[PDB]
Paper text:
We describe the design, kinetic properties, and structures of engineered subtilisin proteases that degrade the active form of [name] by cleaving a conserved sequence in switch 2. The engineering process to develop specificity for the [name] sequence QEEYSAM involved extensive modification of the Bacillus protease, subtilisin BPN’16–24, a canonical serine protease in which the scissile peptide bond is attacked by a nucleophilic serine (S221). The nucleophilicity of S221 results from its interactions with the catalytic histidine (H64) and aspartic acid (D32) that together form a charge relay system. To generate high specificity for the [name] target sequence, the active site was modified to be dependent on a cofactor (imidazole or nitrite) and protease sub-sites were engineered to create a linkage between substrate and cofactor binding.
To understand the structural basis for specificity and cofactor activation, we determined crystal structures of RASProtease(I) alone, in complex with [name] and QEEYSAM product peptides, and with imidazole. The aromatic ring of the P4 side chain has common van der Waals interactions: the Cα and Cβ atoms of A104 interact with Cε1, the Cδ1 of L126 interacts with Cδ2, and Cβ of S128 interacts with Cδ2 and Cε2. Because of the space created in the S4 pocket by the L135V mutation, either a water or an ion coordinates the hydroxyl of P4 Tyr, the hydroxyl of Y171, and the backbone nitrogen of S132 in RASProtease(I). We currently have this modeled as a chloride ion based on the peak height observed in an anomalous difference fourier map; however, added chloride does not appear to influence kinetic properties. P4 interactions are facilitated by a significant shift of the loop containing residues 130 to 133 of RASProtease(I) relative to the Protease1(N) complex. Mutation of S101K increases activity with Ser at the P3 position. Hydrogen bonding interactions between the backbone nitrogen and carbonyl oxygen of the P3 residue and the corresponding partners on residue G127 are conserved. Structures with a cognate peptide bound show that the L135V mutation allows space for an adventitious ion-binding site that coordinates the hydroxyl group of the P4 tyrosine of the substrate. This stabilizing interaction may be an important element for rescuing the active conformation of the catalytic region and enabling strong cofactor activation.
Numbering used by the authors:
A (entry chain B): 277 to 280
B (entry chain S): 1 to 74, 84 to 275
Write the structure that this text describes.
């Protein structure tokens, strides 16, 4: 998961 | 908020502030990179880190969590913020850490969860955790994703793609869909997400862009609504936001449109  | 941002006005939050509603007695969990609690303009009521290499939720070595926290407070100045570190300094995290953050939020009676994060591929275990948070009464808000378009395919990232989660895309200050904002039928609403000025670690300020910036406008809107309607369920809050949004175009690109918290809160 990555920061948007 | 010390730093001026168009986004607060764009979602009609000042109308709620004029009414006397600022999100009092609403607990909002920011599941992100931490919140710099030393920032003079941010108070943090509690939190937890689930990132084993970054054990302090009250620091932020990325900057996003601190910025997002500031946007929640710009929209809902009285909300209570909780720093739930589920991403590291590189902005990346694992499913299990996210789950632990969601579980903590349920155990600690959060009213709203903001997840400014996404994966192209879902976790079945994260789906179970977000579904349980919503069943327990939590308003769960997520960034729709920064994956642009892909023809007729959805580009909405997980967990924003799940039905139980409010998926928030980004518009600019002209109410045009930002080029990066993910698209698809799973898209619910839009909020400001281009060049949003907010708090940064070390007592700083600056502009950032992303669906990460749009999501906390909606989390803050939820807090405003709950302060006016503390008896509403999460179902009712979500319905209010979606059913009163300002239509902006085809729902594939805009969902129901731009949130209008003045209309949502009646
Ligand atoms: Cl997921
Ligand atoms: Na970040
Ligand atoms: Na969703």
């Amino acid at each position: 998961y990555s920061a948007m | 908020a010390k730093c001026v941002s168009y986004g607060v006005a764009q979602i009609k939050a000042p109308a709620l502030h004029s009414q006397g509603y600022t999100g009092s007695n609403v607990k909002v969990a920011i599941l992100d990179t931490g919140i710099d609690s030393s920032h003079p303009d941010l108070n943090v009521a509690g939190g937890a880190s689930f990132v084993p290499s970054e054990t302090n939720p009250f620091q932020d070595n990325s900057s996003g969590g601190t910025h997002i926290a500031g946007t929640v407070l710009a929209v809902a100045p009285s909300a209570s913020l909780y720093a739930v570190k589920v991403l590291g300094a590189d902005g990346k995290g694992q499913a299990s850490w996210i789950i632990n953050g969601i579980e903590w939020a349920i155990a600690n009676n959060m009213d709203v969860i903001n997840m400014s994060l996404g994966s192209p591929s879902g976790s079945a275990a994260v789906k179970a955790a977000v579904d349980k948070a919503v069943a327990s009464g939590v308003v769960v808000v997520a960034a729709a994703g920064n994956s642009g378009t892909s023809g007729s395919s959805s580009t909405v990232t997980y967990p924003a793609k799940y039905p139980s989660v409010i998926a928030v895309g980004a518009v600019d200050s002209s109410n045009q869909r930002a080029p990066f904002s993910s698209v698809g039928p799973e898209l619910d609403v839009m909020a400001p997400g281009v060049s949003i000025c907010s708090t940064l670690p070390g007592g700083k300020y600056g502009a950032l862009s992303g669906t990460s910036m749009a999501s906390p406008h909606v989390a803050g809107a939820a807090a405003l609504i709950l302060s006016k309607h503390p008896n509403w369920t999460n179902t009712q809050v979500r319905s209010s936001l979606e059913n009163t949004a300002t239509k902006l175009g085809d729902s594939f690109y805009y969902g129901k449109g731009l949130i209008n918290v003045e209309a949502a809160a009646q």
